[PDB]
Amino acid sequence: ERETWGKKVDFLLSVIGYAVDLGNVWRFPYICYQNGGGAFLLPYTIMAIFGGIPLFYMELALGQYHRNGCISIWRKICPIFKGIGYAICIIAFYIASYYNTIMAWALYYLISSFTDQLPWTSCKNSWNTGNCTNYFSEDNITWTLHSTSPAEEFYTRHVLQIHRSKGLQDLGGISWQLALCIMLIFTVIYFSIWKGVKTSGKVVWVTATFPYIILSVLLVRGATLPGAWRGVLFYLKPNWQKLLETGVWIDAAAQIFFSLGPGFGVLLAFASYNKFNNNCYQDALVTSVVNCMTSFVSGFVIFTVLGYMAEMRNEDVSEVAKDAGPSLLFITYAEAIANMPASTFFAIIFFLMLITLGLDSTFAGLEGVITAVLDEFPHVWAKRRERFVLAVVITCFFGSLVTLTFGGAYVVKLLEEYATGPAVLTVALIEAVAVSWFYGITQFCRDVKEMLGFSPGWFWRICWVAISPLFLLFIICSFLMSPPQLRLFQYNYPYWSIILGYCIGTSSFICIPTYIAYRLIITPGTFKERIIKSITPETP
């Protein structure tokens, strides 16, 4: 028999810690500022109500009924789409390649914070070149275009050492400091998810609830600051005319789908361990509302601190938050923390928040892949979950050996934009179409009624058959036609970077058509018999 969760709060906190991550602490406030303001919460809630939330509930109920991973459920839903599972696996190898190393940066920052004076306050250090001017109106104020804040120098010349990498063309060298700081992270991850869901479910009691104990302290500190009101009044001020631009809705859809994550193959893995009669409706509602409210509150703390630091300089906002990426956590917020009264305590606390914020998501992705593979091939890797988790962790670390180089930030951005792009959305769209159209939403509603005790309402069937595919289609058709012009640390990505990104995404996607061709060509029969007997779920 499978290994059930052992306690319901284990499942709740696992999903809650997987939904909240290092992205929505820097990505949601930046996105809310850039795309409107308080007028972005309307498209956020509109694309959450009809978008991420019904897909979230669909995946949870599907996994909890079929009791399989993401490579084996398709044996009893639509056998031709089994390739989806493989695609999901590949996607993890990309995300776990870069996501982990971001936490590595955080860990290094935390190791740097154990000093009486934080290293990114003064700029008389070794890595700190000219063009500093000490920032924050320190002594003589001659802030020019060539000047650079000390935290920027610390991030891009000590933690990253990106100045010894000419660019994405030459990723010269490799940081041994970051290599150690990520070997420790992978040790933590593997020893937290190795024994399965009986240990990875009690670990997330302290890495999915510590970020809240830390957000509370960070919020109470930020709110009682000089310049908090300007930091919030520039976060919730509605640019209503911004709603008229399709980009705002496109971005709200992308944000909700990539913060809830309905389609990465992890919700099925977590829900498959649930008891049969477990209420997935209440779990989906609670762990989606908690995700959305956590994103909102994290935006509050980020913007209150930003407003404080912009009021200290007595200069306007939107030039403080120039950088659109993890730099915001390591260059801007680190600066504002370094100017706080008890700078050391809040630096340590903030980077502990970041590490515990990313750890749950890494646990969840890795365990989704582990469950999928452990269930697809049950005879091999049965009494050896530990060895397979070891192989998964080693493979992820070896794939993360490139983002640890000096041009590490370049590959981190390249994997951040691609990999998790139209490939993930296409996989999720094929999942929604396979369950709702092929397996039939009437049979899915019969399954959900025999589990929960009530058939899904008309809203759920309408949002599963029609609106949710017509939402992933919106995101996909809007990501493909508009190609990004990537940039990071005054580096214009080359021509071949977009080709490399397209190949990165296609490597993930091509798992689906390949398996479709394989199954249609190996199956005996005529021209139509192949598809008719490859759509019907396999008899037990």
Ligand X SMILES: CN[C@]1(c2ccccc2Cl)CCCCC1=O
Ligand Y SMILES: *[C@@H]1O[C@H](CO)[C@@H](O)[C@H](O)[C@H]1NC(C)=O
Ligand Z SMILES: CC(C)CCC[C@@H](C)[C@H]1CC[C@H]2[C@@H]3CC=C4C[C@@H](OC(=O)CCC(=O)O)CC[C@]4(C)[C@H]3CC[C@]12C
Can you say which residues are annotated as belonging to the binding site for Na(+)? 17, 19-21, 24, 259, 291, 357, 360-361
Contact, 452 vs 284, CB < 8 A? no
How many other CB atoms are found less than 10 A from the CB of residue 467? 14
Question: Which is closer to ligand X, CB of 64 or CB of 294?
Answer: 294
Greatest alpha-carbon pair distance for the chain in Å reads 83
- Opening angle at CA 105, ends 102 and 109, nearest 5: 145
Interatomic CA distance for residues 478 and 487, integer angstroms: 20
Taking CB under 6 A as the criterion, the residue among 2, 237, 322, 387 binding ligand CCCCCCCCC is: 387
**Closer to ligand Y at the Cβ: 151 or 374?**
151
Nearest partner of 359 among 179, 187, 114, judged by Cα? 187
Is the Cβ of residue 346 or residue 418 nearer to ligand LMT in the bound state? 418
Choose the contact partner of 422 out of ligand CCCCCCCCC, ligand OCT, ligand LMT, none; CB within 5 to 8 A by kind. Answer: ligand LMT
Tell which positions 422-451 bind ligand LMT, by CB under 6 A: 422-423, 426
Measured from the CB of residue 193, what is the shortest distance to ligand X in angstroms? 12
Pairwise CA distance, residues 522 & 540, whole Å: 20
> CB under 5 to 8 A by kind: which of ligand CCCCCCCCC, ligand LMT, ligand Z, none does 373 bind?
ligand CCCCCCCCC
Question: How far is the C-alpha of 193 from the C-alpha of 200, rounded, in Å?
Answer: 5
Minimum CB separation from ligand LMT for residue 80, in Å? 17
Q: Which does 465 bind (CB under 5 to 8 A by kind): ligand LMT, ligand OCT, Na ion, none?
A: ligand OCT
**Residue 396, contacted partner among ligand CCCCCCCCCCCC, ligand CCCCCCCCC, ligand OCT, none, CB below 5-8 A by kind:** ligand CCCCCCCCCCCC
Pick the piece of the chain touching ligand CCCCCCCCCC (CB under 6 A) from 103-111, 387-395, 399-407, 517-525. 517-525
Q: Are 362 and 192 in contact (CB under 8 A)?
A: no
Question: CA-CA distance, 310 to 403, in Å (whole number)?
Answer: 32
- Name the residue nearer to ligand X (CB basis): 154 or 330: 330
The residues of the shown chain that bind Na ion, judged by CB under 5 A, are 17, 20, 24, 259, 357, 360
Q: Does 417 participate in binding ligand LMT (rule CB under 6 A)?
A: yes
| Length of the chain counted residue by residue | 540
- Residue number with the smallest Cβ distance to ligand CCCCCCCCCC: 457
Residue 398 touches ligand OCT, criterion: CB under 6 A = no
| Inter-residue contact 103 to 358 (CB < 8 Å) | yes
Cα 192 to the chain's mean position, in Å?
19
By a kind-dependent CB cut-off of 5 to 8 A, residue 295 interacts, out of ligand OCT, ligand CCCCCCCCC, Cl ion, none, with: Cl ion
Contact between residue 360 and residue 207 where contact means Cβ atoms under 8 Å apart: yes
CA angle 455, 460, 461 (to 5 degrees): 80
Contact 85, 296 (CB under 8 A): no
Indicate the DSSP class of residue 539.
P
**What DSSP line would sit under 224-238, residue for residue?**
SSTTHHHHHHTTS--
CA–centroid distance for 233 within its chain: 27
Task: State the Cα–Cα distance between residues 102 and 96, nearest whole angstrom.
Answer: 10
Alpha carbon 188 to chain centroid, angstroms: 19
Tell the smallest beta-carbon distance from residue 184 to ligand LMT (Å). Answer: 30
Nearest alpha carbon to residue 103 among 161, 203, 184: 184
Q: Which is nearer to ligand Z, 373 or 434 (CB)?
A: 373
Report the binding-site residues for serotonin.
21, 362, 417-418, 479, 482
Distances (CA, A) of 478 to 40, 164, 276, 438, 484: 18, 36, 38, 26, 11
Contact between residue 333 and residue 109 where contact means Cβ atoms under 8 Å apart: no
Binding mask 25-44 for Cl ion (x = CB under 5 A): ---x----------------
CB closer to ligand CCCCCCCCC out of 45 and 395: 395
Residue 60 CB, shortest distance to Cl ion, in Å, is: 18
* Given 437, 454, 496, 518, the residue binding ligand OCT (CB under 6 A): 437
466 binds ligand OCT (CB under 6 A): yes
Q: In the range 146-175, which residues lie near ligand Y by CB under 6 A?
A: 146
d(CA 212, CA 360): 13
- The residue ranges that bind ligand CCCCCCCCCCCC (CB under 6 A) are 38, 41-42, 45, 83, 86, 89, 92-93, 96, 202-203, 205-206, 236, 238, 282, 285-286, 289-290, 369, 391-392, 395-396, 510-511, 514-515, 517-518, 520-521
| Minimum distance of ligand Z from residue 49's CB (angstroms) | 4
Q: 119 to 138, contacts with ligand Y by CB under 6 A?
A: 129-131
Q: Which helix (H) or strand (E) element contains residue 88?
A: helix 83-112
Nearer to Na ion, 33 or 154 (CB): 33
Task: Name which of ligand CCCCCCCCCCCC, ligand OCT, ligand Z, none residue 92 binds, using a CB cut-off of 5 to 8 Å depending on partner kind.
Answer: ligand CCCCCCCCCCCC
Which of 19, 53, 92, 472 touches ligand Z (CB under 6 A)?
A: 53
Query: Which sign does the torsion angle of CA 116, 325, 258, 255 carry?
Result: positive
Structure tokens, 54: 């019904």
Any contact of residue 212 with ligand OCT (CB under 6 A)?
no
Residue whose pair of structure tokens reads 């989906």 in the numeric block: 284
Distance, in Å, from the CA atom of 179 to the CA atom of 192, rounded to the nearest integer, reads 20
Span from 151-159, 223-231, 288-296, 442-450 in contact with ligand Z (CB under 6 A): 288-296
